[PDB]
Amino acid sequence: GMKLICSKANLLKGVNIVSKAVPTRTTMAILECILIDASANEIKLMANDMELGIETIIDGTIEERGIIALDAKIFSEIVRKLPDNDVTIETDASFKTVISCEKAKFNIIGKSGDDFSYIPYVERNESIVLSQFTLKEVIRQTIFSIADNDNNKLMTGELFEIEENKLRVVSLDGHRISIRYIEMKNHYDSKKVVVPGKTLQEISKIIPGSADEDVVIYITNNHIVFEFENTTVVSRLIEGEYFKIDQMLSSDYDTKVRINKRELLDCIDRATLLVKEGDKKPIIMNITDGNMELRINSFIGSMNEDIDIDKDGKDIMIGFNPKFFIDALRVIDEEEVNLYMVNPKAPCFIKDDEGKFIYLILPVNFNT
Amino acid sequence: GMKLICSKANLLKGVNIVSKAVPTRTTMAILECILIDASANEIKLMANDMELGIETIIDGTIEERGIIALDAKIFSEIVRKLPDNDVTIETDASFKTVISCEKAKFNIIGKSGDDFSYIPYVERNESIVLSQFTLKEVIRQTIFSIADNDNNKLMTGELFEIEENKLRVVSLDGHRISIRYIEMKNHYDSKKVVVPGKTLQEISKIIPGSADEDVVIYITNNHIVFEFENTTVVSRLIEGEYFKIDQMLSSDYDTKVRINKRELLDCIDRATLLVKEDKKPIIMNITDGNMELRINSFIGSMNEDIDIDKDGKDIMIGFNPKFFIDALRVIDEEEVNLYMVNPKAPCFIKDDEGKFIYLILPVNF
Ligand SMILES: [Cl-]
Numbered sequence: 001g002m003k004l005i006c007s008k009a010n011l012l013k014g015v016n017i018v019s020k021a022v023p024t025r026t027t028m029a030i031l032e033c034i035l036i037d038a039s040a041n042e043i044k045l046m047a048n049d050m051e052l053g054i055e056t057i058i059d060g061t062i063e064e065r066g067i068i069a070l071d072a073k074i075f076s077e078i079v080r081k082l083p084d085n086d087v088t089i090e091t092d093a094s095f096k097t098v099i100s101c102e103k104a105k106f107n108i109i110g111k112s113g114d115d116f117s118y119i120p121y122v123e124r125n126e127s128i129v130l131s132q133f134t135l136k137e138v139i140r141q142t143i144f145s146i147a148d149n150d151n152n153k154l155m156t157g158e159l160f161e162i163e164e165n166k167l168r169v170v171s172l173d174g175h176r177i178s179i180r181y182i183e184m185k186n187h188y189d190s191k192k193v194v195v196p197g198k199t200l201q202e203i204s205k206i207i208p209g210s211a212d213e214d215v216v217i218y219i220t221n222n223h224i225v226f227e228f229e230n231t232t233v234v235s236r237l238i239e240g241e242y243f244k245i246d247q248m249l250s251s252d253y254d255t256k257v258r259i260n261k262r263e264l265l266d267c268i269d270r271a272t273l274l275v276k277e278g279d280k281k282p283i284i285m286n287i288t289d290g291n292m293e294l295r296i297n298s299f300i301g302s303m304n305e306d307i308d309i310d311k312d313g314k315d316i317m318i319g320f321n322p323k324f325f326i327d328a329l330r331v332i333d334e335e336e337v338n339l340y341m342v343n344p345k346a347p348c349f350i351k352d353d354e355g356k357f358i359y360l361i362l363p364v365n366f367n368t
Numbered sequence: 369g370m371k372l373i374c375s376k377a378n379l380l381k382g383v384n385i386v387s388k389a390v391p392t393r394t395t396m397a398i399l400e401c402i403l404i405d406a407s408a409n410e411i412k413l414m415a416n417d418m419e420l421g422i423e424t425i426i427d428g429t430i431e432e433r434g435i436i437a438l439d440a441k442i443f444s445e446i447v448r449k450l451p452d453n454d455v456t457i458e459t460d461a462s463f464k465t466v467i468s469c470e471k472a473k474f475n476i477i478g479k480s481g482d483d484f485s486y487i488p489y490v491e492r493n494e495s496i497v498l499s500q501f502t503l504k505e506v507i508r509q510t511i512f513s514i515a516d517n518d519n520n521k522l523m524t525g526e527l528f529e530i531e532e533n534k535l536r537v538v539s540l541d542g543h544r545i546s547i548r549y550i551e552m553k554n555h556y557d558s559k560k561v562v563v564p565g566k567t568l569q570e571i572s573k574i575i576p577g578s579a580d581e582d583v584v585i586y587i588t589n590n591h592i593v594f595e596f597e598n599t600t601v602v603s604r605l606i607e608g609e610y611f612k613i614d615q616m617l618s619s620d621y622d623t624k625v626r627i628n629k630r631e632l633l634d635c636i637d638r639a640t641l642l643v644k645e646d647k648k649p650i651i652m653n654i655t656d657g658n659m660e661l662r663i664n665s666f667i668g669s670m671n672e673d674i675d676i677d678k679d680g681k682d683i684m685i686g687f688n689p690k691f692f693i694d695a696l697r698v699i700d701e702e703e704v705n706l707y708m709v710n711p712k713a714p715c716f717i718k719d720d721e722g723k724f725i726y727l728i729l730p731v732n733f
């Protein structure tokens with residue numbers, strides 16, 4: 001049976017990384033485990049839910065080569081509560097596992113690694129490099145508008161599109177579209193894939209986000225691979241033709257509004273206090289020369305607010321789900337934003353001067 | 369109707385203080401409200417649940433005197449989300465309320481203050497002064513061992529006892545006793561009262577906890593009053609004879625253990641990961657120079673050895689790990705003394721300076 005010695009801090013960092021691929025609630029028991037693979041010359045921790053696989057290398061000494069699967073919850077809680085010293089992990093043929101550190105000892109029962117579905121081999125072709133910061137930020141800037149249900153599988157993921165030195169990240173749920181553009185310093189072959197939402201959410205939790213550290217990405221047909229520090233994230237891709245959205249990014253508008261981003265965000269956020277879970281009231285905007293008036297009313301009461309704007313084009317009254325504006329404005333760093341509208345039934349676009357983003361929000365249909 | 373102008377920050381600090389006395393659930397609709405009393409020369413915010421009442425003074429301008437009750441949840445959320453400018457509050461005779469700030473305006477409906485149960489007048493006799501730090505810490509050091517049910521009303525509160533310059537704070541739930549002693553620089557008349565657990569929990573949430581800021585306390589028969597900054601907390605007291613506990617603090621023991629507080633705490637905390645949703649005891653095997661701790665469940669087992677200095681008999685004793693965890697988490701000392709007689713008798717956690725006594729009953733496993 002297996003025998004290893006690891007520093008607690010290295011083992012803790014590792015279990016905390018691979019745990020993001022351990023299913024929250026499942027009927028599959030081996031999926032609730034972390035695999036310890038010490039069969040070769042490296043200590044490898046692994047978690048796989050069949051969609052998302054996470055692998056990490058732990059620094060340590062292999063005294064006796066071996067493999068074991070341990071309950072992810074019990075093993076992480078053990079590692080997290082052990083003293084800050086060397087941790088010994090020892091197993092036997094009956095899968096009885098002893099985890100020892102200083103004068104403390106835990107006896108638990110593991111499972112055979114033969115039941116564990118290993119992360120598949122993925123051929124590494126062309127590599128894409130992004131800073132940890134850029135990847136974490138582009139997910140934060142788009143992840144909120146993926147669908148909250150499984151009615152359409154493609155809507156539960158994010159489109160990743162590369163053409164020459166440009167990357168475009170897209171999410172949509174049928175009510176809005178979030179698009180981010182990134183100019184890269186390298187030229188790459190064209191690629192268009194849909195990454196599951198859960199993959200991007202879980203990778204957000206393990207990527208520190210330094211602007212000085214990089215992520216190497218591989219897109220090989222049915223899989224996406226992310227490498228950073230001593231971790232490998234492998235994810236299945238969503239199959240099918242993604243929505244044709246370039247047709248909807250019609251550059252024609254009848255109204256353009258320049259407004260302070262923080263004032264708009266604070267006002268829409270104020271309005272939401274009047275509408276609670278059992279209510280679904282739109283925020284009404286009345287855009288005139290130099291002014292935007294926002295209203296909401298409910299059983300709790302009403303709100304009226306005026307915001308100074310710079311408006312070009314037609315006066316317009318338009319309604320929206322406040323949540324959609326709050327989600328997009330929360331991820332816009334710019335001091336001011338440009339709102340583009342055609343009419344009260346047409347989409348509204350939040351765009352910037354530098355071409356970094358497009359947030360499309362569908363308004364409320366009042367049916368005239 | 370009423371008309372007031374207040375800075376948002378002053379109004380926010382005030383609603384955040386009085387909200388701690390707003391009952392989560394009530395039989396009287398009006399008690400879900402915060403009372404704004406601007407009938408005299410001060411702006412007073414007030415909340416009450418019939419047991420605990422909180423009053424606070426807001427700096428501002430009274431343009432038109434008046435009283436209104438506003439839903440505590442809606443009013444606090446409004447104040448918290450308004451811009452950082454002056455907030456105007458205006459009401460009419462139909463209780464329609466306008467809350468305005470900068471270019472934002474809210475229209476809500478209030479209630480008459482005439483339905484509100486005001487904090488009663490409490491005669492201020494002898495005053496007791498404690499730092500905010502001391503009061504916040506003594507509650508943290510004892511509040512965890514009040515009863516989690518209402519089977520016995522006295523067990524849901526904490527005993528507050530004063531004799532000359534000594535204050536003693538006691539909580540018990542039938543399985544353990546937490547006693548804290550505080551030496552004060554003033555001498556006071558004897559007082560023995562039982563303060564509701566909820567009062568102490570709510571006051572911990574509003575006391576900043578500075579060692580340089582003081583709390584003035586008044587104990588007048590049926591009530592306890594706490595005063596700090598621009599806030600007054602009033603609470604009813606629990607009636608009845610508190611448990612005779614001095615009889616149980618028998619100084620006789622057969623085993624004394626000196627152990628590192630952090631080492632014991634970390635070990636008992638490690639053991640708890642093996643008990644989930646299960647109620648298994650932690651078993652201690654105390655011998656010369658060593659304490660062995662064990663726990664066994666369906667998940668697995670743990671064995672741990674801790675270096676100790678032991679005087680007296682070897683002993684094997686079992687406990688609910690939670691009771692040790694709760695007490696050790698509030699002990700600041702590097703080392704603790706454990707005193708025992710036998711596996712069925714209480715265990716005492718004591719310090720050398722007489723600052724505390726934590727009594728824990730063992731589990732007769
Ligand atoms: Cl791979």
Ligand SMILES: [Cl-]
Pocket residue numbers: 384385573574
């Ligand atoms: Cl507070």
